[PDB]
Every structure is written in C-alpha cells, then in structure tokens.
Nucleic acid binder design. Structure first.
Length: 186
DNA sequence: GCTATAAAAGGGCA
DNA sequence: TGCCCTTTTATAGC
C-alpha cells in the first residue's frame, strides 16, 4: 500500500503497553491468594503480576485499582486483554469498572534489508543520534517530529518506540527511510 | 542472562 | 521531591 507507505515497508507492531482504571481500591493479598494466574511480592514490586494466554499479555494490578497491561501485539488486543483482567478482578468480588483505557506505548520493528553505515549516520545527525557501539550495538535516534525513538542496527533492522498512535510509528519510519538509504553501507 | 529504548503504574528511600 | 524498581518487546553485542 504505497499511498500510505511510500517506502513500501510497514513496521510490524511488537508490543503494546496500555493502562486502565478499574475504579475501585483492590486487595492485592486477597487477589494473589485467590487468583491462580497471579504473582505478588510486595517487597519486590507493589503490584500483583497476572497473565493470560490470549491475547498473551502480562498485567500489573495495583492496590489503587489502576492497571498496566503489557505484551499485546495490537491496540485492540491490548484493550481486549485489559478487559479480560477487569472481569477476573470483578469475579474475585471487586466492583471493577473500566475507566480511562489508554494506549501508552506501541513498539514496532521492520527490516530495510540493506546494511547501514551507523557512524556516518551518527556524524551527520549528531543532534539526534547517540551511538556508542562498544556499549550497545544500535544507534539511538531520537526523532523530534514525531517525538519517536528509533534503534538502528547495521543489519538494516530497526526498532521504533514511544508511539501513542500507530501512525506516529509509521511516520517516524517513513521519515527515517531516506536517511537510512543515504547511509547505506556498500 | 545481560548493555539500550519507550511507556505506565506506586512504594521506598536518600 | 524524584529515581529505581517491575513488566513487555523488537534489535545485537558481550
């Protein structure tokens, strides 16, 4: 679909983090006792860690009724999964609602299929680049428009994070594509 | 398994 | 007051 993706490449979404407000105070101890699919070491982290198989995700349930859903491959799957946790808490006897569901971060990745001269890229876009190969092999490109972070590897493989809307993921990628080509490694 | 990246939630502690 | 922690995921190196 070249009209939307002129590069002819569409980043595949890998992880969605969403949050929602169950709207009631929760008893984390009771929940970890009753819950089966739930983990809870208050000493290590203040939340019950619960997981479901479909959509395969992990939820962090807090005493406040606030919740973080993680691991889904799309926004709808993220909402669905958050909804499943809500019913699990409702059925544990808590009046869980579903308030202010919000997608907080979308992670995508794609492959341009040509290698990149990272040091060159880093040198010419130094105001956005951060590249210490001896520490981490990818170059961190913090794009300003949209405010997105791309991890660029010499392999031609790229990771795009920090999006709240999938179109930001798509645009950051289309924005970086002519740049990747400019620094293709021959 | 562990360098790095985004993001949310909240308890502890300096 | 504010950071670290915990969780997820692609990527690639030690």
């Amino acid at each position: 679909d070249l009209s939307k993706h002129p590069s002819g490449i569409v980043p595949t979404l890998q992880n969605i983090v969403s949050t929602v407000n169950l709207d009631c105070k929760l008893d984390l101890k009771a929940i970890a006792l009753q819950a089966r699919n739930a983990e809870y070491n208050p000493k290590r982290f203040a939340a019950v860690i619960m997981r479901i198989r479909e959509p395969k995700t992990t939820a962090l349930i807090f005493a406040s009724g606030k919740m973080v859903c993680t691991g889904a491959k799309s926004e709808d799957f993220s909402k669905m999964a958050a909804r499943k946790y809500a019913r699990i808490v409702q059925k544990l006897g808590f009046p869980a609602k579903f308030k202010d569901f919000k997608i907080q971060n979308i992670v995508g990745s794609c492959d341009v299929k040509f290698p990149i001269r990272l040091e060159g890229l880093a040198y010419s876009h130094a105001a956005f680049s951060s590249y210490e190969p001896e520490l981490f092999p990818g170059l961190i490109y913090r794009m300003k428009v949209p405010k997105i972070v791309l991890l660029i590897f010499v392999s031609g493989k790229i990771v795009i994070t920090g999006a709240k809307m999938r179109d930001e993921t798509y645009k950051a990628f289309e924005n970086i594509y002519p740049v990747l080509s400019e620094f293709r490694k021959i």
